[PDB]
Write a protein that binds this ligand. Structure first.
Ligand SMILES: Nc1ncnc2c1ncn2[C@@H]1O[C@H](COP(=O)(O)OP(=O)(O)O)[C@@H](O)[C@H]1O
Ligand SMILES: Nc1ncnc2c1ncn2[C@@H]1O[C@H](COP(=O)(O)OP(=O)(O)O)[C@@H](O)[C@H]1O
Ligand SMILES: NC(=O)c1ncn([C@@H]2O[C@H](CO)[C@@H](O)[C@H]2O)c1O
Ligand SMILES: NC(=O)c1ncn([C@@H]2O[C@H](CO)[C@@H](O)[C@H]2O)c1O
Ligand code: NA
Ligand code: NA
Lengths: 311, 320
């Protein structure tokens, strides 16, 4: 199975149908004022572990989410996991606690400015990755700080290959803790903005990071992604989206495709392309888990986009 | 009585403790990513009409809010208006509807990115400003677009002097409706970002806008403001804030002080300084309306900041 460690959250996403870049005026005192009209609030199922597991499950992989929810309002998510066939083995529900909630203000370029209400996520460390069983691959995504570090240490001690995915949790790390996490990790995945923040906080160049992992995966929105190794790089093209509606969750859809490819022994070019396709499927729908292709549809779309079938 | 036309809303304010300028990376495909901790969601009383009226009410003015609320969740705001002595005369409540809700992300530089769910605000044009009685002064601020345009037409035709504050409503305007609104307006009040957008959309220079109103007022955050009128330009200083907690609503607090000064025949220098003071008292507290200086405290702080007592002139004051 693949262990997916990270936040499990309800999202309130406000997507500007536009680009904040077109609205910044650095020569004025105020850089940006923008008010945009949105529809009625829809609470979405989200969280990085929710999102990555949803994607891996769409592909037919065996996704085991490890994260904490709050008993006050966990039930709709637990019912959804059961409906989707997502194991709740490592989903811990904490009495008298609220689930994490994200208020995400964003645009069509995935410039997410998020106000996060952590709730139960603050106690995510009560789950220990070292207590999970029969795990062949893992990811450690944004979560409570203690939990992220503890998951990294326990997976490394067991020798389980894992992607370190610090994402929104990057502020929680200092240089020394970030360096150690990258030394421990088998792979690191970040978007291009976060990759710059990781280089600044560690002091390492991208080449130096690539000397300390099997792969440094940097996603670049509409421009695709790069997969960097100590001895070469794969450029992964984007798939043209059917429509660009909401990029929130694109990286997590991408990580679920990547995880499936690594588990199934795809080469990096092919694992990266599957990941890219999942990101393009996601962006065509509002909310991180609204896209719902069947496995047959994903296979067809991969052939259409890339001119071959994986293996 | 001063008619305050604009949104009436509940605000959810998410304060980034920093400056967006320090986190923009234009060379990346993602310009900015932030994720910051916030406490439990708490709705604050907001909307431009609520904020401006609250400021005018703190000064002892007679503020008449004109706007729409939704019955499902209007009651806390109605009860608050009653507690404060704000007339509900022109506050219309729509059945089976939610009130406007703003989800506002701020930084410390007073940058705002707001997702706005209009709710009852979509029907703001059901109130007609030209029908309000014995109004001596008005402001038209951000609101449902049809309401904003309608209020401007009606106030101009009734001959009521009014400030035009397109504010966050600017995206809804085109050049033609924006130029028309400015032609009709007695004064325009904007922050500098908005002032740039007005010049861009109208095709007018600040000079050209200034020629079509009695005063063009441009606020510049902690740098203060300018008031351009017939005879000159007032450079209005900021008042040093006791602390900076939340800039949301600083321009509205400023507009309340400006409206009080215009009503009472303050000179522009003095009306501007009162407005500037209200902006500073507001930023020291979370929410657009939680600052609650007594009227004596306002006068004492004006004296400390500026060295004189803020007074007006009956001859220059407004009558209905
Ligand atoms: N506009 C887009 N068109 C097509 N695919 C996209 C687009 N935006 C993102 N994707 C796919 O999703 C991946 C992850 O998106 P990105 O925005 O980099 O991630 P994150 O969500 O972590 O910021 C991209 O590498 C790309 O494959
Ligand atoms: N940091 C500050 N310190 C002191 N006064 C401030 C500060 N920020 C704003 N103000 C006062 O509030 C007024 C309006 O703020 P501004 O940010 O221009 O408006 P808006 O809220 O409309 O964007 C300023 O002209 C100033 O008088
Ligand atoms: N941990 C954090 O600070 C954080 N901020 C946003 N998120 C989640 O990030 C996902 C988007 O990639 C959303 O579903 C959110 O719930 C987070 O986990
Ligand atoms: N009309 C709009 O698009 C809009 N956007 C924000 N606001 C209000 O603007 C006030 C701050 O000036 C807040 O209290 C918000 O309710 C608005 O009225
Ligand atoms: Na490593
Ligand atoms: Na005019």
């Amino acid at each position: 199975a693949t262990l997916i460690c990270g936040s499990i959250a309800y999202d309130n996403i406000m997507t500007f149908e536009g680009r904040f870049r077109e609205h910044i005026l650095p020569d004025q005192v105020h850089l940006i004022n923008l008010s945009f009209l949105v529809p009625t609030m829809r609470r979405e199922f989200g969280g990085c572990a929710g999102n990555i597991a949803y994607a891996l499950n769409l592909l037919g992989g065996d996704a085991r989410m490890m994260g904490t929810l709050g008993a006050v309002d966990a039930q709709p998510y637990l019912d959804r996991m059961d409906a989707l066939g997502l194991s709740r083995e490592y989903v811990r529900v904490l009495p008298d606690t609220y689930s994490a909630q994200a208020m995400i203000t964003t645009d069509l370029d995935n410039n997410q400015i998020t106000a996060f209400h952590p709730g139960a996520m603050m106690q995510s460390h009560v789950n220990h990755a070292g207590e999970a069983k029969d795990i062949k691959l893992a990811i450690v995504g944004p979560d409570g700080f203690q939990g992220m570090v503890q998951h990294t240490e326990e997976l490394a001690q067991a020798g389980v290959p894992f992607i370190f995915d610090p994402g929104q949790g990057l502020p929680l790390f200092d240089g020394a803790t970030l360096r150690r996490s990258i030394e421990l990790a088998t792979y690191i995945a970040v978007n291009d903005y976060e990759a710059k923040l990781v280089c600044d906080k560690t002091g390492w160049s991208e080449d130096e990071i690539a000397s300390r992992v099997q792969a440094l995966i940097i996603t670049r929105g509409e421009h695709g992604a790069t997969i960097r190794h100590r001895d070469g790089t794969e450029q992964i093209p984007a798939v043209r989206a059917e429509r660009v509606i909401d990029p929130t969750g694109c990286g997590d859809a991408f990580r679920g495709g990547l995880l499936y490819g690594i588990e199934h022994g795809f080469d990096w070019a092919t694992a990266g392309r599957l990941a890219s396709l999942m990101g393009a499927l996601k962006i065509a729908h509002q909310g991180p888990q609204t896209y719902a292709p069947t496995r047959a549809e994903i296979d067809a779309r991969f052939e259409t986009a890339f001119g071959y079938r994986p293996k």
